[PDB]
Amino acid sequence: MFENVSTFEEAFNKLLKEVLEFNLENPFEDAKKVICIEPHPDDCAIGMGGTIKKLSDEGVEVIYICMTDGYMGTTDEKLSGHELALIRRREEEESAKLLGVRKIYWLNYRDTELPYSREVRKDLVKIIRKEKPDGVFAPDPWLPYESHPDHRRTGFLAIESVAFSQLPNFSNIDIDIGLKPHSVSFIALYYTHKPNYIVDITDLMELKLKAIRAHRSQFTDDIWETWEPFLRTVTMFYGEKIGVRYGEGFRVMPGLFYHITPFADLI
């Protein structure tokens, strides 16, 4: 097989088009149920809140997994992390209701302390095998200059857990209690410098910003004076790539390209 192509370019295009059936025209069109994985409360709204509302409005069931409790998110010396975390749980429930999300799994690892370990994979694989989602979204762990370990770890752990949820010898007590192996149909990475699929969110921008500001403990008016300009600059960065005002970007690749693929940066 693949003996009749003559150049790498020819082989590459045939591998993507025919063998992997990959395209970027409307990658989320068939989704019935997606899980959006966020490192802290508010990251699904910041990274992809417009698209979450598009998906809920089409009748997609969007479920969050929040990896941490947001304990560390304050500079008030009088507000304990415990009280902050309780506050943030309510803020996310209010944000999520704005976006059409009705279920959140809280892993409750402490903010700034998310482990990178098999144990956290097992928590992700348990929920992926219970919910059988068609799609999983997570941060791109290869974003340049990303300095928060909880973000980098969430991205890697999500990609690894999507792969390992298919393997019956990984976390085998799930299979023994009736949670069968599950194969997700796509991953899409948000918070990405290398998007290849952009969603126009120009008419939902004001809703997205409302869902973000529902996390009031994080976005005081003072902080917002920097964060609205940042958020609009990011959404312009993505929307300009497809000639629209405001976009959200995602990077989608064939499953194969997450491993031993020396030309994965050609998509």
Binding site for Zn(2+), by residue number, is 40, 43, 151
Residue 177, phi then psi, degrees to nearest 5: -100, 5
Using rule CB under 8 A, residue 191 touches its own copies? yes
Quote the CA–CA distance of 255 and 162 in Å, as a whole number: 10
Using rule CB under 8 A, residue 184 touches its own copies? no
Buried b (16+ CB within 10 A) or exposed e, 19-56: eeebeeeebbeebeebbbbbbbbbbbbbbbbbbbbbbb
User: Which position among 115, 149, 254, 255 is part of the footprint of Cl ion (CB under 5 A)?
Assistant: 149
Using rule CB under 8 A, residue 246 touches its own copies? no
Using rule CB under 8 A, residue 172 touches its own copies? yes
Using rule CB under 5 A, residue 208 touches Cl ion? no
Q: Residue 93 binds which one of Cl ion, Ca ion, its own copies, none, with CB within 5 to 8 A depending on kind?
A: none
User: Which position among 121, 152, 208, 213 is part of the footprint of Cl ion (CB under 5 A)?
Assistant: 152
DSSP code of residue 134: S
Using rule CB under 8 A, residue 74 touches its own copies? yes
Give burial (CB, 10 Å; 0-12/13-18/19+) of 233: exposed
| Closest CB 261 distance from Ca ion, rounded Å | 10
Site for Ca ion in 226-265 (CB under 5 A): 265
Q: Residue 90 binds which one of Ca ion, its own copies, Cl ion, none, with CB within 5 to 8 A depending on kind?
A: none
Using rule CB under 8 A, residue 207 touches its own copies? no
Rounded CA Rg of the chain: 19
Our CB check for Ca ion shows the closer of 16 and 84 to be 16
User: Which position among 53, 151, 208, 215 is part of the footprint of its own copies (CB under 8 A)?
Assistant: 151
Give burial (CB, 10 Å; 0-12/13-18/19+) of 175: middle
Quote the CA–CA distance of 96 and 90 in Å, as a whole number: 10
Our CB check for Cl ion shows the closer of 133 and 155 to be 155
Quote the CA–CA distance of 53 and 20 in Å, as a whole number: 29
User: Which position among 96, 159, 188, 212 is part of the footprint of its own copies (CB under 8 A)?
Assistant: 159
Using rule CB under 8 A, residue 260 touches its own copies? yes
Q: Please answer whether residues 2 and 28 qualify as being in contact, where contact means their C-beta atoms are separated by less than 8 angstroms.
A: no
Q: Which helix (H) or strand (E) holds 63?
A: strand 61-68
Using rule CB under 8 A, residue 135 touches its own copies? no
Q: Which residues contribute to the site for Cl ion (CB under 5 A)?
A: 149, 152
Q: Which residues contribute to the site for Ca ion (CB under 5 A)?
A: 265
